Design a binder for this molecule. Sequence first.
Ligand code: CLA
Ligand SMILES: CCCCCCCCCCCCCCCC(=O)OC[C@H](COP(=O)(O)OC[C@@H](O)CO)OC(=O)CCCCCCCCCCCCCCC
Ligand code: KC2
Ligand SMILES: CC1=C(C#C/C(C)=C/C=C/C(C)=C/C=C/C=C(C)/C=C/C=C(\C)C#CC2=C(C)C[C@@H](O)CC2(C)C)C(C)(C)C[C@H](O)C1
Ligand SMILES: CC1=C(C#C/C(C)=C/C=C/C(C)=C/C=C/C=C(C)/C=C/C=C(\C)C#CC2=C(C)C[C@@H](O)CC2(C)C)C(C)(C)C[C@H](O)C1
Ligand SMILES: CC1=C(C#C/C(C)=C/C=C/C(C)=C/C=C/C=C(C)/C=C/C=C(\C)C#CC2=C(C)C[C@@H](O)CC2(C)C)C(C)(C)C[C@H](O)C1
Ligand SMILES: CCCCCCCCCCCCO[C@@H]1O[C@H](CO)[C@@H](O[C@H]2O[C@H](CO)[C@@H](O)[C@H](O)[C@H]2O)[C@H](O)[C@H]1O
Lengths: 175, 60, 154, 42, 161, 74, 174, 175, 194
Amino acid sequence: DNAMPFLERPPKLDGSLAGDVGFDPVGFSNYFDLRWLRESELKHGRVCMLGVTGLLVQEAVCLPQFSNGKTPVDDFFVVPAAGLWQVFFAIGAVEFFSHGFKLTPGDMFSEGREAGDFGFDPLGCGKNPDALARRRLVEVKNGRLAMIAFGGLLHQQLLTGQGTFEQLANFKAIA
Amino acid sequence: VKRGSKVRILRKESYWYQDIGTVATIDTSGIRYPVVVRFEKVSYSGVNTNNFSLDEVVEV
Amino acid sequence: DTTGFSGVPSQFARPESGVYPAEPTEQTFLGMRGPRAPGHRENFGGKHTATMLAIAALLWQPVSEAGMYRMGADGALTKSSFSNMEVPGFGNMKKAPTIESLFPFAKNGFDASPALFGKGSMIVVEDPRDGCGAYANSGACHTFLDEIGDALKK
Amino acid sequence: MDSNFLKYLSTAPVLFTVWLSFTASFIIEANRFFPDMLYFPM
Amino acid sequence: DVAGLTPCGESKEFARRLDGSVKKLQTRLSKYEAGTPPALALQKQIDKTKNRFDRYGKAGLLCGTDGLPHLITDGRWTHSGEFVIPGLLFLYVAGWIGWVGRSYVLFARTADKPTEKEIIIDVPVALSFVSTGFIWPFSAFKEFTSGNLIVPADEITVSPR
Amino acid sequence: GDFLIHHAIALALHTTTLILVKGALDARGSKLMPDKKDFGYAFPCDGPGRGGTCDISAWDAFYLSMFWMLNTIG
Amino acid sequence: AMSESVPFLKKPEALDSSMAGYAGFDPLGLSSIADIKFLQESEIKHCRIAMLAAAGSIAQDIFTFPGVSKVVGTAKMTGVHDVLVKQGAMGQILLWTSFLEVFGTIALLETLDGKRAPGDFKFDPLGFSKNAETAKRYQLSEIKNGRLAMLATGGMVHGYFITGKGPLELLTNF
Amino acid sequence: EMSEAIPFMPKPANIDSSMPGYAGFDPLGFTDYYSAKWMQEAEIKHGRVCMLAALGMVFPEFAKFPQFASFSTNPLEAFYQVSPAGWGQIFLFIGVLETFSYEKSFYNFEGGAPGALGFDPLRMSSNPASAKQYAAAEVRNGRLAMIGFSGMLHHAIVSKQGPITQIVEQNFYPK
Amino acid sequence: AKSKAVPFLSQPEALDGSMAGDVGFDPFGISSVIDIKWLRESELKHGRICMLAATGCLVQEVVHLPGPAFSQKMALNAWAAAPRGGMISILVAIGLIEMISNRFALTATDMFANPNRVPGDLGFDPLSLGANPANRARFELSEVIHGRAAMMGFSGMVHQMIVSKQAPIEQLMHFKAVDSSLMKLGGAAGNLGY
Ligand code: CLA
Ligand SMILES: CCCCCCCCCCCCCCCC(=O)OC[C@H](COP(=O)(O)OC[C@@H](O)CO)OC(=O)CCCCCCCCCCCCCCC
Ligand code: KC2
Ligand SMILES: CC1=C(C#C/C(C)=C/C=C/C(C)=C/C=C/C=C(C)/C=C/C=C(\C)C#CC2=C(C)C[C@@H](O)CC2(C)C)C(C)(C)C[C@H](O)C1
Ligand SMILES: CC1=C(C#C/C(C)=C/C=C/C(C)=C/C=C/C=C(C)/C=C/C=C(\C)C#CC2=C(C)C[C@@H](O)CC2(C)C)C(C)(C)C[C@H](O)C1
Ligand SMILES: CC1=C(C#C/C(C)=C/C=C/C(C)=C/C=C/C=C(C)/C=C/C=C(\C)C#CC2=C(C)C[C@@H](O)CC2(C)C)C(C)(C)C[C@H](O)C1
Ligand SMILES: CCCCCCCCCCCCO[C@@H]1O[C@H](CO)[C@@H](O[C@H]2O[C@H](CO)[C@@H](O)[C@H](O)[C@H]2O)[C@H](O)[C@H]1O
């Protein structure tokens, strides 16, 4: 139905996009393109789904080449500066080529590209239409959860200094 | 020009050269300077009006 | 004739635009009533300014409490500046510009709280009356009405 | 007040003498309270 | 310091100027009794002299070899209070007077008899104009750009040459 | 003192130039006398008409600037 | 048309019996000055916060959650505010109530538009307002108890500012 | 019409929506007196120099060229530490670039677009929507760099350090 | 046709009882010289500043912003003690408010160039408290009267702060009368100077 029943339903959210429970209180999509907003949401969710996996795995696993931070966030600092620049430029190269060098709200969707659709289906998981619709909902819902989850894991690790799995094991309340 | 119109003087030795006056009358005879123009500013002589030809006067 | 201080430019022989805008009666909460572009009030009116003011107030609470809170061995946590967080790849720029750079409460000794002000640096409310009455007072307090009474009895 | 006496006080010498006396008067008063101002103090 | 000058607070010649200027008044004060009106007047003059020299010493002025303050007017910001800032105050007042007078002559041209407005000034209108001068840089620059300050060369009377 | 006198010399050089330049540029004519060229370089005046035309010739601006030359070299 | 609550005064010309808690009481004419919908929303927001404060004063005197007696001292009512600001209790309460009131700002603007009744956040998890009669009756009970709670909240906190006792302890002693 | 920047002021007649960074902002009417295309190209050139200047005031905080590694990070001292042979070569290079704007403005003023010096080596602006977005982005980033450089310059005057150094040391105020 | 405020004078023209607080008070005939629109704009502006100024003096007596630079109970000392950067920030912000709120029609030749412009109406109603037309007459009257009162009150408080170096509330509560030994009025030319 409507996420916030008291509020009138936002007009631009017509339920076509996955996860559209009508949760737009602030007034976005009335000022900005919904396609740009969805593209941002899917990218934030995908980066955060990878990021939550990154925090949890990096606590457990350290490659021989790099040193290990006290917490998974500290890993960012211990790894060499040039390597961080290489990853940043590599992701930038992926962003340039994936969006066809149109990386701005005015030109990104000028080619008619669907929001958050890069045509990445190597193993053909999404070929079925009905399965694609359910999985598109799953991607946005896990992505929103992962954005939330990433916030908590990164902030808790900065606060506790011990890492997620360690915090769950040995739990220390703030005093 | 015509009577009552506002005109710009093109006589280089006029006191009111490139100033605006207004046409009072225009003679129809063989007069050498038919356009009589009156001016708000007075000359060094104190005169505030002078007769000019057509080719010395342009409508504004 | 000119009235004098009338404000009509033609009266004072001052050049005038001539294009005098009609006055819409619409008003925004943090803006004034005035000529506005079509659709401006609907998009950026009372709803926008009140919501954005609300969002800014909510976003201010982390901003006021901005700092690196690190828990020690004991439960106690230590607030450090975000300047302490060194950045690896920017060469000689080891310390990095942060949110405290944009909101330097500590530098100015403000000590901001989520609700503004705070234990350190809070509103100072003091009693001007200084614990004495309006009339019928002793030597320590001579009120204005006491001066009227002193004038009457003399 | 009479309009012809006000039109007389609007004449150029009266306004010139009154305005430059008022001008002289606040230069004098500013140099009385705040004398010896060789510089803008900064 | 600047231009081989010395700050007035540590120059000995400024100090001997102050001491000599106070000795001249003290020898005039030495011929009067304590409460008399000339003595009171002379003492206030001594107080003003001391205040002037005390203020000048702490102002950042630079004194010469003669012990008198010198003004540095090359544009440097450590000395901008001697010409650049008083000059900005002047140009604001001068442009105020100019804009106000120009606005009044343009008003007076649109009168029934323009020359009576210049010997018998329409004082309410002229006071409206003297109030206009506080934003003359913007008013005059908008006037300039909107083609209302500068008249074209073919609207100005010139000699035959 | 050197600054003040240099500015005085600037006023003198500019004022002598003003008189001389006004004489040279208005030598051939002016609003007061448009046909000044027809009278030459050194003529007394054009008479008391048009308000008065004493010292209207270009020679007379030489004459007036000679005092300003003497004042500046002074 | 004269006021039911203040018979010598006129009807306040912006209040009608379709409102909840209406008694014709606006002697000072504040409803003319400011939008009634805002005032209704504000009244209900004051009513609900003070209701929670009134129950909080009573409950804080009755019992106390495990461990809390250490962090606070013997302080009660407003006394606990300065210390629980040091710990993050009041900070977290402020953060989450502030978060709700950002949406409350959007809801108030919807009320000004007229697209929602004031105070209607549609919050009915358990079923009480199924019947219409019960819905209006409970809206009248809510507003009257809330106005009383606001007065009570002023009374309890000023009783703390006088005696330091707290509600139950001021009942037991004096 | 009214100005979009100042909605109480009438639209300045000689500026138009065609121009990339148009906001309707000419309260003091420069374009009704000066050539709008001259002001356009002049604004664009100030912004391009300022965009490099902003980047150039900020960049020696991070890294310096090995030859000038000994020079100061305060830009107003690094100005005087560069040799006059260095400034002569910089002036000769800027002059060589200007020879092209001398043709583009003092001889070929009408043919083209303001600021169009034929410098599009990676063949951008081919896609029209991308071209529109880049044009407006150049003008707005140029104005932003003008404001930012003006700031950072006067900040370097007051506190004798680079802007980033002044930030981290929190020397934000005259002392 | 006499004034109601000053019954022995003629009722001044440009005062017709339309404006709020138009009781017929203009003995010096300034409204006959200066257009009543400018005078009402200036009267409303003076009074609004004075209403804040009166409230400023009393509230600065009661409550302070924290810190030692804002701890001046006496209001005339707050002028000097308050941080200069912030007071000039106030001054610049006031100048910006004047240019935007008057919509670049600031002078006596171009304010009210728009016939829609009304004396005192800068478009300031953030909470739409003047949305009710009925209260408009009372509010405009009560704004004018509050403004006039605050002009008189603030003027009093300043000159009482000068005479008695005391803040207004604690000058009322610790009142000490005028001794007349000091604070003599005038006298610069009676003693011939000094
Ligand atoms: C461009 C924006 C800008 C910036 C970056 C600054 C920066 C600064 N200001 Mg300035 N200021 C500005 C705009 C700005 N100001 C404007 C527009 C005004 C006029 C309204 C002022 C008036 C002002 C004053 C009066 C003072 C400063 C002070 C300060 C300094 C310390 C700030 C501090 O500790 O904050 C952290 C502290 C806070 C955030 C506390 C805020 C206190 C409350 C909110 C004030 C109540 C507001 C009040 C209701 C005003 C309403 C009117 C307004 C809406 C028009 C700092 C240099 C102070 C200073 O120089 O101290 C050394 C000082 O005394 N500012
Ligand atoms: C609408 C706003 C209303 C403002 C009301 C003003 C209230 C305060 C007015 C004075 C109060 C009592 C004065 C007794 C005080 C008094 O009379 O002192 C006397 C003083 C002259 O000194 P004496 O010759 O009296 O010395 C006498 C000996 O006894 C002591 O040496 O008179 C003045 O000239 C002082 C006033 C300045 C005169 C010029 C003022 C500035 C001019 C500005 C333009 C005109 C404005 C109006 C000018 C009148
Ligand atoms: C995402 C970008 C963005 C953010 C983060 C943001 C935050 C805030 C805050 C936060 C504390 C407040 C309080 C606030 C208030 C106002 N905004 Mg908003 N605002 C943003 C975007 C725009 C645009 C594009 C416009 C605009 C406007 C107004 C007007 C004036 C209306 C008027 O007076 O009629 C007011 C009062 C319009 C305008 O006129 O600005 C002069 C206009 O077009 N805003 N805004
Ligand atoms: C044209 C062309 C292409 C190209 C290209 C190139 C080389 C493009 C270069 C683009 C550049 C260098 C853009 C830089 C802009 C800098 C800005 C906007 C900075 C503003 C500073 C600010 C706001 C600030 C500030 C500061 C203040 C005042 C206070 C301080 O305490 C702090 C702070 C730092 C915040 C290529 C080659 C791809 C080919 C293509 O076919 C055609
Ligand atoms: C325009 C005009 C009119 C007018 C008007 C007038 C006269 C208006 C005057 C307005 C005023 C006085 C505005 C004051 C703002 C004060 C602020 C923002 C304080 C900030 C404190 C800070 C940042 C701090 C701090 C901290 C520091 C640094 C260190 C600590 O140790 C201290 C502390 C903890 C406090 C009106 C409206 C009437 C009408 C008309 O329209 C024309
Ligand atoms: C319009 C508008 C709204 C608004 C607003 C605002 C800011 C409203 C504020 C209004 C105010 C501040 C009114 C204050 C008036 C003060 C007066 C009359 C004091 C007079 C003192 C006197 C007579 C005295 C005296 C004294 C003397 C000399 C002797 C002394 O020893 C003591 C003593 C003190 C007794 C809002 C923003 C809500 C939105 C809305 O949509 C539109
Ligand atoms: C984010 C900013 C956006 C716009 C910024 C542009 C600012 C425009 C010019 C800024 C001028 C700064 O103004 C200057 O800074 C501060 C303001 O209190 C003052 O500085 C003063 O207070 C600060 C704050 O405690 C003290 O640390 C400092 O020692 C003291 O001198 C200066 O005396 C003033 O001259």
